[PDB]
Amino acid sequence: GVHTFEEESTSPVPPAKLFKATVVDGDELTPKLIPAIQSIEIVEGNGGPGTVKKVTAVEDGKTSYVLHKIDAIDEATYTYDYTISGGTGFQEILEKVSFKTKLEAADGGSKIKVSVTFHTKGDAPLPDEVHQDVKQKSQGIFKAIEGYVLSN
Question: Which of 67, 99, 112, 138 has a CA-to-CA distance to 8 between 20 and 30 Å?
């Protein structure tokens, strides 16, 4: 089943700075800023479309990981689309979760568009617990990096 959510938001950070921090340096910054995220390792690819990243996370001294795959990346349009699937840390009811993110310039800051598609096994609805856990983790990382760039 396909369950789609959108968020439109704003940042005082201009797009090039926000994209640099969230996408180009996101692998390096995230584990430094977020205690729960242990590491982000490129296991396949160059950093272009098809790159797979192993994202390792800790809860209550128990480690799990998920795989992060680049669907689209374009610095010029501030486009980053990626898919989360697989690994020990992935909710059993999910086939995959596909993110489409785009920034644009807005009065010296950014407009942010995120579209999230949860793909469930069979025709399962999306449990609110799974929706919330993925949203909180992905927004946590984004907001930590955004706050960091503002303080730099």
Answer: 67
Domain boundaries, the chain: 1-152
Elucidated via? X-ray
Q: What is the CA radius of gyration of the chain?
A: 15
Classify residue 22 by its DSSP letter: I
CB 33 within 8 A of CB 145: yes
Question: What is the rounded distance in angstroms from the CA atom of residue 60 to the CA atom of residue 102?
Answer: 34
Three-state SS at 67: strand
Q: Amino acid letter at 104?
A: E
Measured between alpha carbons, how far is residue 49 from residues 8, 53, 94, 148 in Å? 24, 12, 22, 27
Q: What is the C-alpha to C-alpha distance for residues 138 and 49, in angstroms, rounded to an integer?
A: 20
